[PDB]
Design a protein around this ligand. Structure first.
Ligand SMILES: Nc1nc2c(ncn2[C@@H]2O[C@H](COP(=O)(O)O)[C@@H](O)[C@H]2O)c(=O)[nH]1
Ligand SMILES: [Cl-]
Ligand SMILES: [Mn+2]
Ligand SMILES: [Mn+2]
Ligand SMILES: [Mn+2]
Ligand SMILES: [Mn+2]
Ligand SMILES: [Mn+2]
Ligand SMILES: [Mn+2]
Ligand SMILES: [Mn+2]
Ligand SMILES: [Mn+2]
Ligand SMILES: [Mn+2]
Length: 276
């Protein structure tokens, strides 16, 4: 399967309507919300319980974390990517019992985006940083496996992560819709079980009420549904979209911990998958 740039790539709201009209792509019975399961749900044997969070924005102190096996964090774990914020998040991770903690960056991790940092010469406190201050920011995540257009196999699960989102404010890892993003999604390997991205695919937990617009990536949706077909696609990005959906094969989890007003009150989402 070769994914090409969609006819409606630049206009996600129109893409959504188009695919609903022509293919019922976002319609029942196959597409629907999935209710969360409570933390005391027994985990069946031969399964891994994934604890999904995102968009914590350095507000980790009060988060009540559930039993599980592997933590997935889909970015915006800081406000500006300051090394001190990365250190605080890493300290928090180290006190969690999970066997593995897998992390990707989001747009707020400015110091992780080396092209953004170079272009700096809007962000006075980030501009103050000297090269030696942030040459090792990802190295600061000693209690995690950090993914960036890269993958890890853990307990047999193939997990791929990438930070890129459609251009919004020119913050970290922003790219134009279309081929620029498709070039990144084409790196996701076919047999990926769990895909982590910072933002949503078109149509799944990507509604922005203030704009009355869908904002998910159309190339990402086509990649997920047509080429890669992971069992789980976890992301955040659009805080308002916190919650879970399915298309009948892939489960889509918007794990945004913060609300749109940056209150860290959305509970972590647990999700069980059978071990491969
Ligand atoms: N319209 C629009 N809003 C976005 C986009 N990305 C983020 N936002 C808005 O900004 C909020 C916070 O995003 P953040 O600055 O933490 O990346 C999101 O919950 C959403 O309301 C986007 O691509 N388009
Ligand atoms: Cl939605
Ligand atoms: Mn229900
Ligand atoms: Mn965020
Ligand atoms: Mn250094
Ligand atoms: Mn923002
Ligand atoms: Mn596949
Ligand atoms: Mn696989
Ligand atoms: Mn598999
Ligand atoms: Mn974000
Ligand atoms: Mn169903």
């Amino acid at each position: 399967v070769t994914i090409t740039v969609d006819e409606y790539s630049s206009n996600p709201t129109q893409a959504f309507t188009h695919y609903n009209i022509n293919q019922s792509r976002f319609q029942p019975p196959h597409v629907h919300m999935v209710d969360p399961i409570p933390y005391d749900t027994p985990k069946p044997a031969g399964h891994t319980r994934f604890v999904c969070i995102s968009d914590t924005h350095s507000r980790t102190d009060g988060i009540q974390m559930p039993y599980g096996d592997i933590l997935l964090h889909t970015g915006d774990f800081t406000e500006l990517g300051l090394p001190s914020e990365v250190k605080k998040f890493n300290d928090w991770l180290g006190n969690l019992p999970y066997e593995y903690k897998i992390v990707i960056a989001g747009n707020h991790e400015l110091t992780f985006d080396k092209e953004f940092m170079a272009d700096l010469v809007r962000f006075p406190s980030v501009s103050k940083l000297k090269p030696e201050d942030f040459d090792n920011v990802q190295s600061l995540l000693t209690n995690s496996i950090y993914l960036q257009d890269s993958e890890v196999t853990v307990k047999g699960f193939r997990i791929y992560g990438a930070p890129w989102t459609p251009w919004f404010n020119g913050w970290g890892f922003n790219l134009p819709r279309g081929q620029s993003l498709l070039d990144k999604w084409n790196l996701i390997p076919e047999g990926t079980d769990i895909l982590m991205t910072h933002g949503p695919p078109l149509g799944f937990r990507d509604w922005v009420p203030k704009e009355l617009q869908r904002v998910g990536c159309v190339e990402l949706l086509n990649t997920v549904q047509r080429r890669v077909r992971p069992k789980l696609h976890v992301f955040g990005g659009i805080h308002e979209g916190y919650g879970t959906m399915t298309d009948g094969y892939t489960t889509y989890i918007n794990a945004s911990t913060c609300t749109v007003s940056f209150q860290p009150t959305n509970p972590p989402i647990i999700f069980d998958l059978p071990n491969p």
